Symmetry: D3
């Protein structure tokens, strides 16, 4: 929308999706929350106004978060991309898109918000 910044948030588990979602809405973002990579890509391809993408690396089934980010960057080459991972962050070195941030658990609400805001601000 014209009034708000929309973040596509893609996370599997109920506890975390709502945790990340409320963190982002408290900071002033609109959140489109989805529970798979496939659903995230569908949304990206739908023509919906998406200003940044916060995505898990692994979902229950492919496509993974690496692929979500590639689709986002095809639509918008400057798209803010934050990956959220449990364990292996070293895969980012070979799979992450340029100028993305990966956050590996544990991380704080402040870290998530700073990452998202910094990347949106860097758009120029």
């Amino acid at each position: 929308s014209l009034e708000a910044v929309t973040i596509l948030l893609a996370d599997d588990e109920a506890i975390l999706l709502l945790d990340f979602e409320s963190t982002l809405t408290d900071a002033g973002f609109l959140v489109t929350a989805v529970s798979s990579g496939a659903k995230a890509i569908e949304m990206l391809k739908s023509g919906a106004a998406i200003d940044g993408v916060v995505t898990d690396i692994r979902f229950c089934q492919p496509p993974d978060g690496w692929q979500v980010a590639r689709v986002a960057r095809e639509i918008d080459p400057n798209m803010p991309i934050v990956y959220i991972s449990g364990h292996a962050a070293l895969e980012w070195a070979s799979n992450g898109v340029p100028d993305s941030i990966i956050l590996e658990k544990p991380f704080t609400s402040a870290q998530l918000i700073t990452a998202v805001s910094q990347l949106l601000n860097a758009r120029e």
Copy 2:
């Protein structure tokens, strides 16, 4: 000093109020003004201003480009954040070095992060 003061200049009162409250909740003192003319007057008065957040365009001249120049003449290291509903094309030829430009809409968190990062990088 005892405080960190942000000069905030925007001709949309709703935006001015919203940004003022977000910045004050974040720990900043805010001098909120409605025109580039008043921002420049605040700067030229000699008030202690630690960062400037300005719209690029107002109803009347001077514009935000000029506000940032006066600020930088006073303090060459001044944190400068531009607010716009257009205009990064204009920023490319008119913006001062090391400034941030935020295109509307942006969240409270974005403004806070921009201001804070520039203040933290100072020297």
Copy 3:
């Protein structure tokens, strides 16, 4: 687990203030009143994810030394210095990729500095 910040400042009023700022933002904080206690904490094998330290304390060693100890343990340790007096000592004494905050600074500035340095580890 959690993200823990070691915070070292010899003024109780400031220590409490910086501590509450950081806990509100989601960090656990180990708040200590000297550089010596900070170094003791760092060497104990306690899980520390970032260090926010004053430069000058009542007792030696100074915060410049706290940072060196921290970086010996973890070469990528986020380091934020707090200062009120000589911030230009940082140019000759600070560790690489560190941030120095000169008083006065806001809660937001502290949160941003800590958060951006943690995020940069990738």
Copy 4:
């Protein structure tokens, strides 16, 4: 295109010659001019210019600040390197975003590195 072309503007012929030869040895084509007026004329003519290296001050107006603005109006991503024998105080309020300012003296290697890094960072 087939070449990478740098517009180089300086009113000191010895410097102009020296920078021209360093840049050409490094692989660039150089359009070397002696004033801001001629640099702007080159820009407004529609010649393919991939980077601008300009002195801040010439004998007559327009100055290097204005040369960089015209360049950035044409191409908002234009690599801009300023050459000065003073003036970073002036750069703080007059320079365009993402530009480099080199204070005299600087080596051939510095100019090459500045131009190359800005070209490499483009997009």
Copy 5:
């Protein structure tokens, strides 16, 4: 020893040109004509300090894949892409902290890109 750059480009005239540029600057160069040969080199355990690769080759795999293999072996591997066609594919395909050079570029640009990425390893 030496600093070795793996260079992959399927045009012999360009490969020779980029190779001479890099050897004149002090690098050893392993010059290969395909992404497949580059990946074979990377997986062999040969000491490679940086990779400069075309995006499109005659045979598969492409340079985007060369970079991923390089980064699997070394997560901090300097990566420079060379392209003439779609450089905007980099936004969605490039690895983090890589540089893409779009033709035309000068010898200086190539040397600067490789050198600055090597230097950033610290």
Copy 6:
């Protein structure tokens, strides 16, 4: 001087000092070449026009290169600092000054020149 950029170069061994020296003079720099940290510090303290410092970490005797850089930064807080080391570069993480570059052997002439020029250019 007004005409040239002066680099203080501090290196122990004859082969390398002359190698680094000629690399820097070919690139257009004036080089003040010294063979110890003590001599480098003396020069820095003499009031000589020094625009950047390229220094070894270890000399035959203390003061070391870490200390050379601290002295340089006391004189000029913006001084370009490039360290040159054989083996242990990880000591830079705890001992290097902010915004310095460390080059660990082997490195090329291009790398040295790029490091020096980039840091001089970043002075603003």
